Structures are given as structure tokens and as C-alpha cells.
């Protein structure tokens, strides 16, 4: 197991994790927008 | 300071930052769930 294999596997883990953190943010941004609409309605 | 040293240090920064962004998300997901419970209770 070379240094480049370690770097590649770290980069791959990071990219997979970044996509998951983005998905979680989008879910939470929808939830916050729903609360904001509830507190803002007439 | 070689190119590989730069790549390694970038990867290490990114992995540390990813763990912190995850912790912040978990804190905020608990806060949003608490608000959702407050707006949903009988």
C-alpha cells in the first residue's frame, strides 16, 4: 500500500463525505424554510 | 517542501474541517428538531 494509494483513498472518502454533508444541508435548509414560513404567515 | 507534502497537508486540513462541519451540523439538527417539536406539540 503506497503513499499515493493512501492519498487517493483519503480524497475519495472526502468527496463521498462532502456529498453527504451537502445533502444533509439541503434537507435542513428545507426544514428551516418551512419553519420560517410558519412564523411569517398571516 | 515537496508537492506530496503539500497534498498531504491539504488532505489533512480537509479531513479535520470535515469533522468540524459534521459536528456543527449535528448541533444544528438537534436545534431544528427542538424547534419542530415546539411547533408540533399539542
Amino acid at each position: 500500500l503506497s503513499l499515493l494509494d493512501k492519498i487517493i483513498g483519503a480524497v475519495d472518502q472526502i468527496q463521498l463525505t462532502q456529498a453527504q454533508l451537502e445533502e444533509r444541508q439541503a434537507e435542513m435548509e428545507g426544514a428551516v424554510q418551512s419553519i420560517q414560513g410558519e412564523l411569517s404567515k398571516l | 517542501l515537496s508537492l506530496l507534502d503539500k497534498i498531504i497537508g491539504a488532505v489533512d486540513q480537509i479531513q479535520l474541517t470535515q469533522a468540524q462541519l459534521e459536528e456543527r451540523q449535528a448541533e444544528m439538527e438537534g436545534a431544528v428538531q427542538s424547534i419542530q417539536g415546539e411547533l408540533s406539540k399539542l
Partner: nanobody
Amino acid sequence: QVQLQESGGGLVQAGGSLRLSCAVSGIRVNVNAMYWYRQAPGKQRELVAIITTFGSTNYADSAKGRFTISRDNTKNTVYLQMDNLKPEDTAVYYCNAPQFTDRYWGQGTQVTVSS
């Protein structure tokens, strides 16, 4: 699949020490950042410690210098040494990699600290 087999918990007195182990299969611990979490009854899962691919560490504030994460690359195993334990550390402890936390959790290892 990824396998996570946690061990080393038990019943310990306050001020005591434990060393948790997580034996990993299906990913390499010297390639992937690895995390320890804990979950107390009825509470949200808390990140405790992280070790990066190239061996940097960070800890939750609740560890406050008491915990040490490490790994053995040959045994593909991650460790959490926990010193000066307190009742507030009672929880089930879990190891995972960040890319799988949405997907799978092992059974964990129960830690109970009594005064």
C-alpha cells in the same frame, strides 16, 4: 459490506481507565479517517474523537484531554483510550467512518462509570 466490531467497554469506577477497540473490515484504517461517537440513553449521538488518514487528531470538548484515539494498521483496528472517567461518560460507544454514518452502525460497546 463494512464491518465494525466494538469492544473494551464494561463497568469501571470513576477515575478509572478503559481502552476501547473497533476491529474494522472492508475499509483500511490507514486510508480512511475514523471516528468514535457515543450515545447516552435518550440523547443524540455525540462525536467524541477523530483520527485523520495522516494521523492528526481532534477531540470533543467533553474529552478535555482525557481521551486518546489511535490505530493499529496491521490489525486494522481503531482504539480509544479513556482516562479519568466520570459518571457523565456513561454511554454506548461506536466507531465509524464518516462516509457510512448514514448507512450502518455497529452494535457499540457499553461503558458504565460508577462512583
